[PDB]
Design a protein around this nucleic acid. Structure first.
Lengths: 141, 62, 38, 69, 639
RNA sequence: AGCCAGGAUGUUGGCUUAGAAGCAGCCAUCAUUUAAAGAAAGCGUAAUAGCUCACUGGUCGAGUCGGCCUGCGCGGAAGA
């Protein structure tokens, strides 16, 4: 397991193939081709969905392309199609922008557990749900 | 002198050496000369057909 | 170098000495922070 | 994935061989010449099988004796 | 019979022309000074050149060695106006780059070298300044190999010390890869066994004809070591001249120069045949042109000749002689051409000093047009301001010193016209009125200009119904609106206009198309008074190619420039990025890339997107307008 | 006090979709895995990355750090 060399977790919606205003120079900043994030970017994306910003490892070598294992979208953007409102903070405690419940967010939390690291699910629960708390969202426990 | 630039449109500007013939204009007092269109730095009038011996235009190549 | 009447530590790596009685602030990091008097 | 390609006999195609050599390495024409002339001579050491077989087949195409170990 | 031409690609101030001078000394005398340090003769010719410490233009000098002619030219490797040196490539088949001891060949030299690769003609390396500290005895040559990207190998080896070895080499065993490329040399190599150096020398001559690799060279001229034998290699290795005399005679001009005592001299090479003295000859203008006089430019002094040998180059006077004009017709050659890869290398203003002397100064600019082909200028400005196509820093010093020498005029400018374009702020109603409340003419209309998307340009529609619009009346209103588009209240050109005409009351007995046409401009200025305006400026994209190691530092240039960051990509060791910056600040960008890259920088751009907006205070360039009737009424409208 | 260690996945987080990605400005200032780790005091980025400190291990082995009060001193302090 080699350490830091070039891998960076940055790209927008997984449905946006070959970006240039979003990523562009950021993905092709190194020797890796701009084409590498369209022909190979949707090779794993199509299996689930599109339009979801999902981070992926970009460990660039001298071997043209690179090795990668795609991970899990951020809880933030997940709370739009699974929250109702597409917005978020700006006014955290100043006003209650939205709300869910532990019965639904704890329900979604363990799905991301393949990427999450915890001794037990409950922990990841209060973690991700607290992430929801930062958005001005208050859990309906 | 102060020659009158005939024809329609001209490439003359600031300096640019031209050619001057006689002939008043009888409408602009003080002007007693003409410019020889097509001669020297003064190109001929664009897209003329009739009376092109004046204005310096060559015979329609087409 | 600066020769101010007041010579407080600018950077973190600034150190106060008192060579030849005259107080100085030598900085191993930034050569601009080197100052005398005070 | 660590195969060694040795050259035993260039055969009746020292020309093609020399090409394969310098081509697989990039040594000076001379160096390559001497190498072959100093047969047997190791062409590559600890190279990918694909690569090993690639040159190997090349040698065969020319008609030379190669060694794979 | 004749003698092959020889180049002198002294890239990055190689000083190779001085090597040409020392070569002129070795080829002497029997009666010559032998030259001296600095300038110094060496066919320096024009004043301000040797005084400037560098030639302002490529020269020429007749020479002979090994019982054969040996023409050579130098240096034009400076800067900066190197396109004339590219013109020199047409003037000769040979070449002789002067490699620096400083980190191999100079990066500026690489451009002329690759251009030489475009030339399709033979060249040979030279290890100049061998007698100096820090010389790359085994390092700089490696830079020559890594940079040359070919298969060049030294014809000799030397190191010092006071040593000056040349013929002692070279490349035993390991050498001969160029022979390996040949099927014949590859066959003899297939045969095995050692062989005579000449036997591989034949294949070396075969590849040498193709310019497959540059011949090796070594030694500094200052040490007087290897500066002679290398010239012998230039004499023997050089391709034979295409002598014939079969006719008919043909050729073309390569360059021309305005000597103060000339007053002009048109150099030309005899591509085929020969031209008898005082005889008529064909011209590209399709008119007869007798050769009244011509003579070879000997390095010690110019000399007349009764006739030119085939393949020979020589200057000749003429009543006229356009650059690259046919001398046949006609010669047939194919080669690439370029001029420092730029339409204009940052044009700069050049307003003449004095009320009247500047008019003569423009004629001096015409004289500049007479000189180097790679230059252009025109009075695009209404003020007839000059805008030279010439580019580079030192080249401006050359044109300026030339202005201070051969001529008696000078100017100081660089900013040039802003080329700003004003656009409407928002739609607003307006009307000139009706009848004569009022001012002439009686004709009037209710113009209704509206805001438009950027880059849309001027736009209008005939909202007025017939016959009030008139079949041949409203068009005068349109031409008049175009007349009002000629200048805004700020004096900036109109842009993104949307003038939708509405009302158009008029009286028949007094109505004229000219009256309504005069009325239009008042409606335009009136709508402009209410629009509030908004400045618009050019924002052309600016692609750039710089080495990746400096690529981060170039990002630092981004913050220093108005131009926005843009998508870019790597290209091998090279790096590239697509910029997008305003033309007003774009001129300094070439200086920025020139500084950050250490001269390794390169860039290109083209104008696009009129939309942009700029600050601050919305400054505008006066002014419009005069020389037309009705403007006084417009002045009356203001109060 | 010095010494090789460590100082995490989503956080490209919502934000004015040009970015603010611990560190322009916003408000929030999560909770886990835990010997420890601020969703961060400074540095460095177009923004990342990156380099540090907080903090905590161990090596280490005895006093040490920061205010308050005052005494007497140094600097600030160059003229014919």
């Amino acid at each position: 397991a080699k350490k830091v060399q070039a891998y960076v977790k940055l790209q927008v919606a997984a449905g946006m193939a070959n970006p240039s205003p979003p990523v562009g120079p950021a993905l092709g900043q190194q020797g890796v081709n701009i084409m590498e994030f369209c022909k190979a970017f949707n090779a794993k994306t199509d299996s689930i969905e599109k339009g979801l910003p999902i981070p992926v490892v970009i460990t660039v070598y001298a071997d043209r392309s690179f090795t990668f294992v795609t991970k899990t979208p951020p809880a933030a953007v997940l709370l739009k199609k699974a929250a109702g409102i597409k917005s978020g903070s700006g006014k955290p405690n100043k006003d209650k922008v939205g709300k869910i419940s532990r019965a639904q967010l704890q329900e979604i939390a363990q799905t991301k557990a393949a990427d999450m690291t915890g001794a037990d699910i409950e922990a990841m629960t209060r973690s991700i749900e607290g992430t929801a708390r930062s958005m001005g969202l208050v859990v309906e426990d | 002198v102060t020659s009158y630039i005939g024809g329609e449109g001209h490439n003359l500007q600031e300096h640019s050496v031209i050619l001057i013939r006689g002939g008043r204009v009888k409408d602009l007092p003080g002007v007693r000369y003409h410019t020889v269109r097509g001669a020297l730095d003064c190109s001929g009038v664009k897209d003329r057909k009739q009376a092109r011996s004046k204005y310096g235009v060559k015979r329609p190549k087409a | 170098m600066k020769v101010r009447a007041s010579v407080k530590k600018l950077c973190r790596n600034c150190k106060i000495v008192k060579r030849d009685g005259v107080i100085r602030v030598i900085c191993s990091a930034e050569p601009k922070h080197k100052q005398r008097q005070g | 994935t660590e195969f060694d390609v040795i050259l035993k006999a260039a055969g009746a195609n020292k020309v093609a061989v020399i090409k394969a050599v310098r081509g697989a390495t990039g040594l000076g024409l001379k160096e390559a010449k001497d190498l072959v002339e100093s047969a047997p001579a190791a062409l590559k050491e600890g190279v990918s099988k694909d690569d090993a077989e690639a040159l190997k087949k090349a040698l065969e195409e020319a008609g030379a004796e190669v060694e794979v170990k | 019979m004749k003698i092959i031409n020889i180049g002198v690609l002294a890239h990055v101030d190689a000083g190779k022309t001085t090597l040409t001078e020392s070569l002129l000394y070795n080829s002497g005398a029997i009666t010559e000074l032998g030259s001296v340090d600095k300038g110094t003769t060496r066919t320096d010719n024009t004043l301000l050149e040797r005084q400037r410490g560098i030639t302002i233009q490529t020269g020429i000098t007749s020479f002979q060695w090994e019982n054969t002619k040996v023409n050579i030219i130098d240096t034009p490797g400076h800067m900066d106006f190197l396109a004339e040196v590219y013109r020199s490539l047409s003037v000769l088949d040979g070449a002789i780059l002067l490699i620096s001891a400083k980190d191999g060949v100079q990066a500026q030299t690489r451009i002329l070298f690759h251009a030489l690769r475009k030339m399709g003609i033979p060249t040979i390396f030279f290890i100049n300044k061998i007698d100096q500290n820090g010389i790359d005895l085994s390092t700089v040559y490696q830079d020559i190999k890594e940079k040359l990207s070919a298969e060049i190998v030294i014809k000799q080896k030397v190191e010092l010390y006071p040593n000056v070895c040349v013929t002692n080499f070279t490349e035993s065993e390991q050498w001969d890869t160029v022979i390996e490329g040949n099927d014949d040399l590859l066959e003899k190599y297939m045969s095995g066994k050692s062989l005579e150096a000449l036997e591989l020398e034949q294949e070396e001559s075969i590849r040498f004809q193709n310019c497959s690799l540059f011949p090796l060279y070594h030694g500094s001229a200052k040490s007087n070591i290897g500066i002679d034998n290398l010239i012998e290699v230039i004499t023997n290795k050089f391709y034979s001249s295409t002598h014939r005399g079969p006719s008919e005679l043909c050729g073309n001009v390569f360059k021309i120069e305005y000597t103060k005592k000339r007053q002009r001299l048109a150099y030309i090479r005899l591509y085929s045949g020969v031209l008898h003295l005082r005889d008529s000859v064909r011209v590209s203008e399709k008119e007869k042109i007798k050769v009244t006089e011509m003579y070879t430019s000997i390095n010690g002094e110019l000399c007349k000749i009764d006739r030119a040998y085939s393949g020979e180059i020589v200057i000749l006077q003429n009543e006229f002689l356009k650059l690259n004009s046919v001398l046949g017709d006609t010669k047939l050659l194919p080669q690439r051409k370029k001029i420092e890869n730029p339409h204009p290398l940052l044009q700069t203003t050049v307003e003449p000093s004095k009320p009247e002397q500047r008019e003569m100064l423009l004629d001096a600019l015409l004289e500049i047009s007479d000189s180097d082909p790679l230059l252009r200028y025109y009075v695009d400005s209404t003020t007839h301001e000059i805008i030279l196509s010439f580019l580079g820093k030192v080249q401006m010093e050359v044109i300026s010193a030339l202005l201070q020498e051969k001529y008696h005029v000078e100017i100081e400018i660089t900013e040039p016209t802003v080329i700003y374009m004003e656009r409407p702020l928002k739609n607003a109603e307006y009307t000139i009125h009706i009848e004569v409340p009022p001012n002439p003419f009686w004709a009037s209309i209710g113009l209704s200009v509206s805001p438009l998307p950027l880059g849309s340009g001027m736009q209008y529609e005939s909202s007025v119904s017939l016959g009030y619009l008139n079949q041949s009346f409203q068009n005068a209103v349109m031409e008049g609106i175009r007349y009002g588009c000629e200048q805004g209240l700020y004096g900036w050109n109109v842009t993104d206009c949307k003038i939708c005409f509405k009302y158009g009351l008029y009286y028949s007995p007094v109505s004229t198309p000219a009256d309504f046409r005069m009325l239009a401009p008042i409606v335009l200025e009136q709508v402009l008074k209410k629009a509030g305006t908004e400045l618009l400026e050019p924002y052309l994209s600016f692609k750039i190619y710089a080495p990746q190691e400096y690529l981060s530092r170039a990002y630092n240039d981004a913050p220093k420039y108005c131009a926005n960051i843009v998508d870019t990509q790597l290209k091998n060791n090279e790096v590239i990025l697509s910029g997008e910056i305003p033309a007003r600040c774009i001129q300094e960008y070439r200086s920025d890339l020139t500084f950050f890259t250490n001269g390794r920088s390169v860039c290109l751009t083209e104008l696009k997107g009129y939309h942009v907006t700029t600050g601050e205070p919305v400054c505008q360039p006066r002014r419009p307008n005069s020389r037309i009737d009705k403007v006084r009424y417009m002045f009356n409208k203001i109060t």
